[PDB]
Write a protein that binds this ligand. Sequence first.
Ligand SMILES: [Cl-]
Lengths: 217, 224
Amino acid sequence: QSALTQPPSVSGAPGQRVSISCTGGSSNFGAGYDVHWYQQLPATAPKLLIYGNNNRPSGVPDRFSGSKSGTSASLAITGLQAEDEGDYFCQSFDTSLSGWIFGGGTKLTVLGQPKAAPSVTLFPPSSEELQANKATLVCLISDFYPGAVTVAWKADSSPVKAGVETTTPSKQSNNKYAASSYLSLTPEQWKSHRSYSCQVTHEGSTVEKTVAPTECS
Amino acid sequence: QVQLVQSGAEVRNPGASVKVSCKASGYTFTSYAIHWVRQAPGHRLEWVGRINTDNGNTKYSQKFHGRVALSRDTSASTTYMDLSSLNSEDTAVYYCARAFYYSSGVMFDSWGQGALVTVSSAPTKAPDVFPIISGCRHPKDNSPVVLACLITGYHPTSVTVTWYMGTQSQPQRTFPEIQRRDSYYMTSSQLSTPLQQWRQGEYKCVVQHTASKSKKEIFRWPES
Ligand SMILES: [Cl-]
């Protein structure tokens, strides 16, 4: 293979150890080229972590280490901290392509973060948006862990079958997940029903919030 | 210290071209070669090419079919990447990196911050921002009041939001951006702490969209 292969992800508890393998082929590792490793924390540029199979640039702690045999290379991380979460790429050179190649990257997850139920707030359309002949219901879902959530909408007590757009959940700066669901209605549809409900399911619990055109009057 | 600083984000139509720059400092510019590496969404890092900062010799990846050109201005300590005939697969963050030769190889010991190039046919557009509220603005019923701003109809990503009570920055809750069918984006930002009562104009959300050179503040939640 003229490409490097890394596992898509590894996980480990705080203070424990993980190992990230990287395998290549005859035209890179088999040609005698060293392997380098790079760390990419969220919203940051790649940083050189290991060069020349097992050397650390100045400043890189001893708990990040590398090794390489003829076929495989590995990055080891001991004493895992939450700040280690991110993507880790191996790198080498390939003679058949005559260029630099990178591994697919391994996303490191540091376990131990406790379960957290979502905080859910449901917003009705603003008067300004209604004045512009648009009605959007906004279901904001914050501070939950782990990432999976399911959203269902109800017009009165009937399931809404159109107009729903929900975000893939993603971690925010607080290391917790957030998500949003938007129900697009016409002003007429909004005023036609008695209420609307956003329903959020997360780790054996469901929380539902309701808004009505009549309230606040 | 050694550092590479790149130019800002760019938007281009398909078939156009883009030039990104990489200004070097903290070391002898012509003594180290510079590489360019890109990272497209949902893809791994991909080597673009190399340029010798002394004589200007270049070596490009064959994946680009001559669509890329690298240059350097020794007087300016800057290298440049030109990528022509842009397509949607070129939407990516483009990094520059310094090549370091050790005893038995070369690695990329220092990286620029990255420049996001977005290739799209949708025109750049500032966001509309609506004040949204849970709790009726003037609640009689002792329910907490949550303030948020609904941010829609902008392109490209992203927007930056900050909240203020008077002059002090306030804690906020951020959310993903989502792309609509029309290719324009939509997002929200929520004031973290619930309120009870406040003077009109006390709180505000500030939505910055650098691509459209615009900034929009909402400081009034009216009666509904
Ligand atoms: Cl107000």
